């Protein structure tokens, strides 16, 4: 899979205006959603060469596990009885199924009109046996838990498979969750592409959205190095 | 509504402009009177002419502010259901069943 | 783009007032006929400016202007009465 | 409601619909009538072949991501859009050695034709029988009812 995207941001106060704009532009109001991601890295206690059976260089990378959680797990008592809609974001045995992903650093190129990232994904449906916890399974693969973050936001479905997410991110630790996006929302526009044509067509869709928001909110290509999960 | 208030204000401004025009006319004719040696209208000539300028100045202050309010309202009050159909028919249906 | 409307409107106001007073100065003061023609010109320009104000106002105005069980029971009746299957 | 739901959930993109799949207003509706006819003949057949033959017998018919607000609205009309089906249970007198049970189910899978499902079991664990049958033709249900009542239900 190839994910083409553009990012942006707005401060908490820009919320309502942005929601109103995206609602008119797309024709639909926002849809609330969340996801928990846990990132894993090769066990540092174990050490293996970084080469193939064909003696070809392999770069060590992180594995990302992601799933959803019922919203009720994110609403405490103070949050109680508050319209379960877009406005809520302001006031902020076996294993379960998971999405397993390994991504590559975005495609190189000066003057790229969008970010383009390859993503290898498979789906974990269930487990059984002695150590069936997703954690044990990751260890069995030779990986260890590194960090994890929660993301809550609203999304918009647009034409040609374009999706827009307005998100807030919180890292999770016993010491406490800290909001990586403290201050506002991370804006993301993207399309997932399973032929050159559809790639240039997808770029166009993103470019038209960028064009349509120019003046109001700017969408740009983030730094490749900021989208590289390789271990080092 | 708010838009109705804005439109009403604009209409009021139009009225003001009209007034300005009328008193422009008055001013002209009465200036014609003053040049002929009738000074009795000097109070009325200048009054209508001054009331014109005052009315025009008031309209200018009112109109310029209204334009500013429009610019400030961009994104706020101003842009930059089939479930309803169903309830109609169900209402209609239960009404047929129980007249 | 609205700032342009503000600028045009302000310029129009200044033009209107200035032209009014200045025309008022121009008369009182075929030279006389020429002066009359000039007066006609100024006045006409002023009127056109009024129409311009009207255009602006119109522009602004245009800117402003531009359960389940109940259903299951109800359908149960509807379908029954409609087939007339009872027939007994 | 369906097109919108089809757009909300899956596509990330646009709707996909079929007349045949999406066809039914009126055609789905007519079936309601034809089924009523079909059910009438079936009850006639049952009276003749069964009710009249075995004295105590009688018949009882019985009913067979978060968009959820939408699915609930559509679910409400499942009553109108379901393939019509009724189950006719035939009550038979209990023999003191064994209790025979017989029931038929009528349905219209394509909305305009009829399928008849007959289940019969009169267990005596020495004699125990079970039939699970499906017929598209009333002629054959008469023949099978006859066969059943003859051997198993009759004295």
From Swiss-Prot, chain A:
Under the GO molecular function aspect, what terms does this record hold? RNA polymerase II core promoter sequence-specific DNA binding; transcription coactivator activity; transcription coregulator activity
Query: What family is it from?
Result: Belongs to the Mediator complex subunit 18 family.
- Keywords annotated in UniProt: Activator, Nucleus, Transcription, Transcription regulation
Q: Where would you find this protein in the cell?
A: Nucleus
Q: What is said about its interaction partners and assembly?
A: Component of the Mediator complex, which is composed of at least 21 subunits that form three structurally distinct submodules. The Mediator head module contains MED6, MED8, MED11, SRB4/MED17, SRB5/MED18, ROX3/MED19, SRB2/MED20 and SRB6/MED22, the middle module contains MED1, MED4, NUT1/MED5, MED7, CSE2/MED9, NUT2/MED10, SRB7/MED21 and SOH1/MED31, and the tail module contains MED2, PGD1/MED3, RGR1/MED14, GAL11/MED15 and SIN4/MED16. The head and the middle modules interact directly with RNA polymerase II, whereas the elongated tail module interacts with gene-specific regulatory proteins.
Bilayer-spanning residue ranges: none
One GO biological process term: positive regulation of transcription elongation by RNA polymerase II
Q: Name any GO cellular component annotation.
A: core mediator complex
Coiled coil start-end: none
Look up the further comments and give them: Present with 1011 molecules/cell in log phase SD medium.
Q: Which InterPro entries match?
A: Mediator_Med18
Q: What is this protein called?
A: Mediator of RNA polymerase II transcription subunit 18
Q: What is its main location?
A: nucleus
Swiss-Prot record, chain B:
* Gene3D superfamilies named among the record's database cross-references: 1.10.287.3490
**What is the recorded name of this protein?**
Mediator of RNA polymerase II transcription subunit 11
Compartments (UniProt record) = Nucleus
Judging by the UniProt lineage, the source's domain of life is Eukaryota
Keyword list, A-Z: Activator, Coiled coil, Nucleus, Transcription, Transcription regulation
* Coiled coil spans: 53-95
Please indicate if the UniProt record lists Coiled coil as a keyword. Answer: yes
GO molecular function annotation:
TFIIH-class transcription factor complex binding; transcription coactivator activity
Q: What is the effect of changing residue 21 to K?
A: Results in a decrease of TFIIK and RNA polymerase II occupancies at active promoters
**Function noted in UniProt:** Component of the Mediator complex, a coactivator involved in the regulated transcription of nearly all RNA polymerase II-dependent genes. Mediator functions as a bridge to convey information from gene-specific regulatory proteins to the basal RNA polymerase II transcription machinery. The Mediator complex, having a compact conformation in its free form, is recruited to promoters by direct interactions with regulatory proteins and serves for the assembly of a functional pre-initiation complex (PIC) with RNA polymerase II and the general transcription factors.
Show the GO cellular component annotation of the record. core mediator complex; mediator complex; nucleus
The principal location of this protein is: nucleus
InterPro entries xref list: Mediator_Med11
Q: What else is known?
A: Present with 396 molecules/cell in log phase SD medium.
State the similarity comment: Belongs to the mediator complex subunit 11 family.
What's one Pfam family the UniProt record gives for this protein?
Answer: Med11
Q: Name one GO biological process term.
A: negative regulation of transcription by RNA polymerase II
Q: Does the keyword Isomerase apply?
A: no
Swiss-Prot record, chain C:
> Per UniProt, what is one Pfam family of this protein?
Med22
Chief place where the protein resides:
nucleus
**MF GO annotations:** transcription coregulator activity
Q: What role does this protein play?
A: Component of the Mediator complex, a coactivator involved in the regulated transcription of nearly all RNA polymerase II-dependent genes. Mediator functions as a bridge to convey information from gene-specific regulatory proteins to the basal RNA polymerase II transcription machinery. The Mediator complex, having a compact conformation in its free form, is recruited to promoters by direct interactions with regulatory proteins and serves for the assembly of a functional preinitiation complex with RNA polymerase II and the general transcription factors.
Question: Oligomeric state and partners?
Answer: Component of the Mediator complex, which is composed of at least 21 subunits that form three structurally distinct submodules. The Mediator head module contains MED6, MED8, MED11, SRB4/MED17, SRB5/MED18, ROX3/MED19, SRB2/MED20 and SRB6/MED22, the middle module contains MED1, MED4, NUT1/MED5, MED7, CSE2/MED9, NUT2/MED10, SRB7/MED21 and SOH1/MED31, and the tail module contains MED2, PGD1/MED3, RGR1/MED14, GAL11/MED15 and SIN4/MED16. The head and the middle modules interact directly with RNA polymerase II, whereas the elongated tail module interacts with gene-specific regulatory proteins.
- Which family would the database say this protein is a member of? Belongs to the Mediator complex subunit 22 family.
Curated annotation (Swiss-Prot), chain D:
- Gene encoding it? SRB4
- Membership in a protein family: Belongs to the Mediator complex subunit 17 family.
Name the source organism: Saccharomyces cerevisiae (strain ATCC 204508 / S288c)
Additional information: Present with 1720 molecules/cell in log phase SD medium.
- The identity of this protein, by name, is Mediator of RNA polymerase II transcription subunit 17
Q: How does it assemble?
A: Component of the Mediator complex, which is composed of at least 21 subunits that form three structurally distinct submodules. The Mediator head module contains MED6, MED8, MED11, SRB4/MED17, SRB5/MED18, ROX3/MED19, SRB2/MED20 and SRB6/MED22, the middle module contains MED1, MED4, NUT1/MED5, MED7, CSE2/MED9, NUT2/MED10, SRB7/MED21 and SOH1/MED31, and the tail module contains MED2, PGD1/MED3, RGR1/MED14, GAL11/MED15 and SIN4/MED16. The head and the middle modules interact directly with RNA polymerase II, whereas the elongated tail module interacts with gene-specific regulatory proteins.
Subcellular localization(s) per the UniProt record: Nucleus
Q: Which residue ranges traverse the bilayer?
A: none
- Top-level taxon of origin: Eukaryota
């Amino acid at each position: 899979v190839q994910q083409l995207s553009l990012f942006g941001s707005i401060g908490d106060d820009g919320y309502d205006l942005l929601i109103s704009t995206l609602t008119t532009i797309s024709g639909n109001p926002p849809l609330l959603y969340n996801s928990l991601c846990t990132v894993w890295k090769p066990n540092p206690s174990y050490d293996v060469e970084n080469v193939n059976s064909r003696n070809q260089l392999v770069e060590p990378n992180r594995i990302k596990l992601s799933k959803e959680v019922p919203f009720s797990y994110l609403i405490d008592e103070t949050m109680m009885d508050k319209p379960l809609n877009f406005r809520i974001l302001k006031s902020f045995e076996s294993c379960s199924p998971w999405s397993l992903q390994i991504s590559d650093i975005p495609a190189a190129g000066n003057n790229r009109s969008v970010s383009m990232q390859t993503i290898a994904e498979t789906i974990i449906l269930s487990s059984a046996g002695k150590n069936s916890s997703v954690s044990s399974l990751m260890n069995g693969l030779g990986y260890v838990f590194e960090f994890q973050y929660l993301t809550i936001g609203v999304k918009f479905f647009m034409k040609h498979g374009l999706i827009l997410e307005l998100q807030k991110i919180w890292q999770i630790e016993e010491a406490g969750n800290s909001q990586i996006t403290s201050g506002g929302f991370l804006l993301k526009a993207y399309i997932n592409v399973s032929d050159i044509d559809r790639i240039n067509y997808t770029e166009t869709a993103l470019m038209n959205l960028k064009k349509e928001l120019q003046g109001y909110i700017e969408l740009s290509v983030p730094d490749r190095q900021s989208m590289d999960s390789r271990v080092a | 509504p708010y838009i109705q208030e804005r439109l009403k204000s604009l209409n009021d401004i139009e009225t003001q402009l009209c007034s300005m025009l009328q008193e422009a006319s008055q001013v002209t004719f009465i200036f014609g009177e003053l040049k002929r040696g009738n000074e009795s209208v000097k109070p009325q000539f200048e009054n209508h002419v001054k009331q014109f300028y005052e009315r025009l100045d008031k309209s200018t202050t009112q109109l310029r502010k209204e334009i500013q309010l429009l610019d400030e309202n961009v994104g706020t009050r101003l842009l930059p259901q089939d479930t309803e159909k169903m309830e109609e028919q169900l209402d209609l249906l239960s009404a047929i069943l129980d007249p | 783009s609205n700032q342009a409307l503000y600028e045009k409107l302000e310029q129009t106001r200044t033009i209107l007032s200035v032209k009014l007073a200045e025309l008022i100065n121009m008369t009182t003061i075929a030279v006389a006929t020429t002066s009359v023609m000039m007066v006609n010109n100024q006045t006409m320009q002023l009127i056109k400016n009024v129409q311009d104000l009207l255009i602006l106002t119109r522009s602004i105005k245009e800117k402003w202007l531009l359960d389940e069980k109940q259903i299951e029971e109800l359908l149960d009746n509807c379908i029954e009465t409609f087939v007339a299957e009872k027939t007994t | 409601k369906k097109t919108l739901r089809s757009r909300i959930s899956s596509p990330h993109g646009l709707i996909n619909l079929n007349v045949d799949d999406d066809i039914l207003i009126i055609r789905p509706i007519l079936g309601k009538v034809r089924f009523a006819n079909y059910k009438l003949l079936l009850k006639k057949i049952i009276k003749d072949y069964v009710l009249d033959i075995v004295p105590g017998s009688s018949i009882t018919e019985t009913e067979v991501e978060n968009i959820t607000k939408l699915n609930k609205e559509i679910r409400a009309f499942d009553k109108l859009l379901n393939i019509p089906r009724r189950e006719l249970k035939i009550n038979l007198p209990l023999t003191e050695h064994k209790s025979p049970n017989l029931s038929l189910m009528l349905e219209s899978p394509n909305y305009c034709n009829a399928l008849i499902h007959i289940k019969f079991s009169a267990g005596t664990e020495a004699n125990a029988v079970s039939f699970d049958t499906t017929f598209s033709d009333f002629k054959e249900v008469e023949d099978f009812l006859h066969f059943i009542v003859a051997e198993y239900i009759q004295q």
